Design a protein that fits this description.
Entry title: Inferential Structure Determination of the Fyn SH3 domain using NOESY data from a 15N,H2 enriched protein
Name: Proto-oncogene tyrosine-protein kinase FYN
Number of domains: 1
Number of helices: 0
PDB class: transferase
Keywords: transferase
Helix content: under 10%
CATH class: Mainly Beta
Structural class: little secondary structure
CATH superfamily: SH3 Domains
Radius of gyration: 11 Å
Assembly: monomeric
């Protein structure tokens, strides 16, 4: 289970970066190293690069 859980919302005022909310789930897709990964949601279907290093999965 490499699924990440949303913690809170974020205020992104850019083009690359996007805003998101909690209660959603993000699927893996990117595999560079550990920085800005994509956020694939099976809900809205909106991508965006953000730092989801402050979150955590569910065991």
């Amino acid at each position: 289970v490499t699924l990440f859980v949303a913690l809170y919302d974020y205020e992104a005022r850019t083009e690359d970066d996007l805003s998101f909310h909690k209660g959603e789930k993000f699927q893996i897709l990117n595999s560079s190293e550990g920085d800005w990964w994509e956020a694939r949601s099976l809900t809205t279907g909106e991508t965006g690069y953000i730092p989801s290093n402050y979150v955590a999965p569910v065991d």
